[PDB]
Amino acid sequence: LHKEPATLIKAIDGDTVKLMYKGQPMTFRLLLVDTPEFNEKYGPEASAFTKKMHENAKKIEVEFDKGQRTDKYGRGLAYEYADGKMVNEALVRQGLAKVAYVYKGNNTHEQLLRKAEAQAKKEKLNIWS
């Protein structure tokens, strides 16, 4: 896998964001995770967390996996990095997302994220409290 550039257009919620990629506006859905919807518990905090991560970042990158790059809704499916830090992993590690939607062939970072989730559960953070 490799990182490719992108720039923030707009924060959306815990696991979606509007980015410019190859000069086109795209909604991205973060691979292998599920945040609560904004109207759910830990939704607002998940959204804040991802927004803060985007807005503090000097450099946003996206990384496609080996499979499908777009979902059925036209959302880009990627791992996102903010200043080299994976937003998908940071959400899990903080108990603001669950590992989810692990489809065969787009699951390169599954075990990295499961390790983060096990630590968040251990610490009883947020979703796991």
Q: Applying CB under 6 A, which part among 27-35, 45-53, 81-89, 111-119 lies near ligand THP?
A: 27-35
Residues in contact with ligand THP, counted by CB under 6 A, come to a total of 8
Q: Distances from the Cα of 57 to the Cαs of 10, 36, 41, 88, 104, in angstroms?
A: 13, 23, 26, 15, 31
Q: Which of 45, 63, 75, 110 is labelled catalytic? A: 75
Q: Tokens standing for 13?
A: 């919620």
Distance (Å, rounded) from C-alpha 77 to C-alpha 94?
21
**If we measure between CA atoms, which residue out of 93, 64, 96, 74 comes closest to residue 18?**
74
According to the annotation, is 13 in a ligand binding site? Answer: no
Binding mask 67-106 for ligand THP (x = CB under 6 A): ----xx----x-----------------------x-x---
**Site membership for ligand THP, residue 29 (CB under 6 A):** yes
Distance (Å, rounded) from C-alpha 64 to C-alpha 77?
7
According to the annotation, is 15 in a ligand binding site? Answer: yes
Min separation Cβ 59 and Ca ion, Å:
25
Q: Which residues form the interface with ligand THP (CB under 6 A)? A: 29, 31, 34, 71-72, 77, 101, 103
